[PDB]
Design a protein around this nucleic acid. Sequence first.
DNA 1: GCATGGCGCCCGAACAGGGACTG
DNA 2: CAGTCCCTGTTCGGGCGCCAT
Lengths: 429, 211, 225, 558
Amino acid sequence: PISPIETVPVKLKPGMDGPKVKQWPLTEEKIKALVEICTEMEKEGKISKIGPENPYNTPVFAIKKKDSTKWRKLVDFRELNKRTQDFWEVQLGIPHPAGLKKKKSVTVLDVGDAYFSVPLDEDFRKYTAFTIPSINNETPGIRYQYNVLPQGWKGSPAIFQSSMTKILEPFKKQNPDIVIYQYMDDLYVGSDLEIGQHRTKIEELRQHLLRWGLTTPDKKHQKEPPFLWMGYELHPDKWTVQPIVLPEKDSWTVNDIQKLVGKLNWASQIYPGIKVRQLSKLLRGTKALTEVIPLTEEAELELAENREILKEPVHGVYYDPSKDLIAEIQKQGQGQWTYQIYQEPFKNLKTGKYARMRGAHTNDVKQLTEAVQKITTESIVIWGKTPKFKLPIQKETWETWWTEYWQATWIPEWEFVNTPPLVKLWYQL
Amino acid sequence: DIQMTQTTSSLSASLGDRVTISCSASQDISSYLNWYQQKPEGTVKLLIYYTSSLHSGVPSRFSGSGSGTDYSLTISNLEPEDIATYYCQQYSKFPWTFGGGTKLEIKRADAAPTVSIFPPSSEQLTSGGASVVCFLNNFYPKDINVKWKIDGSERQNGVLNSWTDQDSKDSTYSMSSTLTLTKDEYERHNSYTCEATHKTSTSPIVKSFNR
Amino acid sequence: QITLKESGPGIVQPSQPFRLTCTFSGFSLSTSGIGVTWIRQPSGKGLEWLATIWWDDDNRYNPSLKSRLTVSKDTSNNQAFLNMMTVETADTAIYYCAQSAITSVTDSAMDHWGQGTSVTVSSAKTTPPSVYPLAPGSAAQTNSMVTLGCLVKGYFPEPVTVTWNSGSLSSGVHTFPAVLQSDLYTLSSSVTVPSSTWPSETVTCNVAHPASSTKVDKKIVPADC
Amino acid sequence: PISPIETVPVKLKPGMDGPKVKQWPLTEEKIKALVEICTEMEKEGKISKIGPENPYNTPVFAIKKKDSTKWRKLVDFRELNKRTQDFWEVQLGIPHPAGLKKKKSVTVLDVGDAYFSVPLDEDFRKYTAFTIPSINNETPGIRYQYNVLPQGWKGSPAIFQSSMTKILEPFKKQNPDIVIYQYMDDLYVGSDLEIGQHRTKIEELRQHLLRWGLTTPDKKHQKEPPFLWMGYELHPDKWTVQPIVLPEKDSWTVNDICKLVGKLNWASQIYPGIKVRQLSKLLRGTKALTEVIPLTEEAELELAENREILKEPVHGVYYDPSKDLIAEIQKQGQGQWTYQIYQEPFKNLKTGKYARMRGAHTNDVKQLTEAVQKITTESIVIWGKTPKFKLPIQKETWETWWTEYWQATWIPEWEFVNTPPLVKLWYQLEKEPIVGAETFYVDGAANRETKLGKAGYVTNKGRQKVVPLTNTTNQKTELQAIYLALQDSGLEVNIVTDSQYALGIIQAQPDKSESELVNQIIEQLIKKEKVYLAWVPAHKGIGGNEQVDKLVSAGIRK
DNA sequence: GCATGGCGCCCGAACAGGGACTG
DNA sequence: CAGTCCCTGTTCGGGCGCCAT
Ligand SMILES: [Mg+2]
Ligand SMILES: [Mg+2]
């Protein structure tokens, strides 16, 4: 019975019932884990066994974080999260650090347990129920539900936000420079000190916390070769928007003209100062493609002119925190991926290109997921909200392995799309 | 226990030249190799880290290269400070390992050993001991070969040797060699010979004496 | 501004422990990437790795000696130590302590080194050297240059300071590295001068051996019979 | 007896009330019949006589089991089920023999009265009320309420399942090295102990359930392979699927097919390649459920081959942990695919077939991709591990696929098995415009309000063609244009469209579809030696187009 | 006036969402 | 653009096979 604190009420969005999502297959290696970490949570009684009588459900799976080599249970509370919401956006929204993006070194702390110490609203508990697969379906599933604020549920941080703001009041007053943001199960701490100092300061916060019972994971650092642990910190500076460009041909076959006509045409939607007529003229009659058309000075006049318009920020762009976020990803080629984050069609807030993780094993699924997580992390720092993903992949395939390479406490909202190479504008070069 | 090897042991070049040393691993150590410069005095400095990268304040005439198992250090064009031993360390898996080093010397017109043999100083003998010094001086190259023949018959016991580093001025080597016998054994023979087999004379240089 | 200095007992008795102290300045053993490594180098041989003590204390040992080695620190004083147990003659070498740092995802190097300490294993008891002159005879002097020698035999421990004519004579002089003869050091020096000077003008061997508070000279009197 | 197990609380679907459904009159034949059974039940505790204030009732008639001629109570819980809250069902998937490990000693059990042995929530019984009418219009019939788990009731299954799970709960923690495969109330127990220490456990268990109300009747197999479990027969070294006897009727009717197509499925899990895509399409269309149907020879071939396989007996093996898994895909008739999952040489763990054509226009890597994906998931479920693949499609082919595609993809560790039909894309667009061909500018258009429209092209050499079409739309016409140019052209050509639609469809390297147009548009591609398509934003001014546009815009509105 | 729950398969329908044309 | 249509993907329902009560 963890805390004397009085339970805060929550009621899912009107005319909407709780989650009734099925449990996807889990691989031994995960069940085993998912069991042990559920058996023990049951004893400390943060969780409680339950049977059929509870009509709701949500799925669970676990990921062995490479970050700490310690398995972490993960409940896909996206439906439930959606259902319940006057809560975390309107009622107890947690403000955003204008300047978290502005730091040069930010780290994420998994402050999940901090939650296992607050009683979950009495009535609202039927909703967080989940189940556990058994290999070869040897026995029925093992259902349970939460009694304390749950992990990865938009409500926790909102509810805990009170005690969290207290636990950090000191650290922040004694260290006014550091900036701290909380998004669900994580703590975003960013500084402007040398990396060596940051590491320290972060390692020191991991203390001030511990003095409060909030224990955070033990990220390991190996002394053999790939010093992966060197990338733990985020640096919102190599964060550079990637505008579009129009290649350069010494001479331009017919082909070359058209392609560049379309791109220039598409882009017109983004930036409205793109003209094509005085440039497309050079293509007037049904001619062979392979023909080396020469660039009029009337034409070239704008070819290089239009490009000048592609080297800058967009037209009266703004970010409305009241709308959802969307992100698009196009498998560009040989490990390369590019994306755009927008709320309104053709009025993006960002573009860029996740290059690649050298250990991408030449796996587009793996790389893709990683791009997602990556892109997701950015959105959180920058605007403080997760974007809905338009995933360049076939549902059924993505659903088969996204977990395997997933290494995050949260899960973003996604959908699938088969939309071929529209123009090459979403630029490859 | 990832064995690191530098084939070329002692390489000798000359000012102006451009040289390259070999460091071959035992496995694809994925460019996790570092280069070290030990100067004849004894201090060790860092040249290259991550097969090719340059440590701060290190001359540009320094380059690293290698991939998987074969790596090489390339000094653009020699100077007088580059002429010293070189080491490559592999940091891809403890235990860490270095090569066997590659001594970088200075090529100098070959010269022959200025042999000199000596009689067991009275006092040495006054106390019951007899050594027989024999200096081979300023020869080139290093690879020399001594031989101690007593009244013709070669001797094994009592023989000692000591080489010197390349002299930084006349670029040559020298070498003490001592025959330590007992006084009774010294006073039990008359002939003692020092023989110097160098890459200069088809005939060993000799010098000797009789008590 | 970074620097490291090995401290040691210089000479240790066979099968007894010794303890090297690496005192540094210019970085702490706290800053994340940092760590100290201990390299060894036997007389004339190549560099050998011993151990590296990291800031997290995930110290790693040379497998071939872990059973005897032991690494540690005192981060507050900026010192890092290395203890070796049951040392054998083979442990005689120059010990370096270097500042190793993991910079990035791919770079880890021992950026700065010390100068090392000379640890020698020998149950030999301090003893001064007996000097013997080397005057050529039986194939004696003519018009050119003659080579004069000087022998320093049976001393402990290193080193010895050998000069000719108290520094006066110093152009054609060769002092060779010593050698162990029955756990006792021996070595010679050869000085070469034109006949026009010797024997006409005295030539003396200046031998000094700190450890025994001794200083001795030996005149190179020419051969008699 | 009945169990000391705590009762699971079941409510009614929110806002509703119990079932108040009239009992229809029955024969004295049936009434006194029922009265027998109920009296029996009531004495056995399964039920109890209720008071008059209970307004609920659910029908209940009776029937005769011709063989015995004896009778059995049949309650119609239809209405309750409509008003009973819904549970989150626990049985997640049925087990499979391919997922068992050879255990020294083995036993199989079964509980008696399983449902009739688990207490029904005190507070819900009133709803399971039913009446057994009086012969005549006399005093009310005899009222009764349910006390145990009423069979034919929504909850019943799920509730007995959890109950059975909790009852085994302890015993398992005490003997963590015994496998207890529980299915409803069917317990298969196996362990590597000595037939003795085993019996001492087996017993020790029977006495643990008995203590809980679970009667473990003498319908338990001990040292009795073939063990008859879950529809199979477990043999020490191997397992057999209980004999499958397919209906071989003279004149096939729609419904009779389902009893065969299905049974065929059931066997697809052990018998290699059981192509059924054939006789399947029979049921296709919108058919009655007793309507007769002609056994097409196409369907005959399927039945022929299949009937053949089902003739030669076969066995499956048990799963060996260490020896990792292998899944081998085989290409079959169009759409069909087969696979045998194994670990050693030619011993099959299990086999199956996949033939779902995903999407309108697909091809053959895609299908294989999907094959592999579906096979994995199916193993994760039986062994909790992904298997190793042996696929008929060489590294070369694949390598090109994913690198060329704009959609992300992957396949796990796999080698190439040389065993045709092999899988490899059939055609291949061009990256750059080719010189030695006319650049055919295509297009087409249509008027919804008419169902008609034209489609054709204009080549750089002034050539032209414009066929007019009826009953088609823009996406039909624009995909039509591309067809011509792919006839009215050499072995090398550049085609230009404005339909991302038609363009997309193509780049995907389709190699089969539903519509013929795009089956023939495919045919032209496999035929030609070089093609390259480019795209341009129609209604933009781009020359090569305007020509074809206007040419096919003879009907732009009205 | 004939059961319930589970999984699979195969078919067809209603459904959802994106893109394209039209007055 | 508002109102509609085409096309493609997905979900769901219905019947069968199998398992059990
Ligand atoms: Mg049975
Ligand atoms: Mg058009």
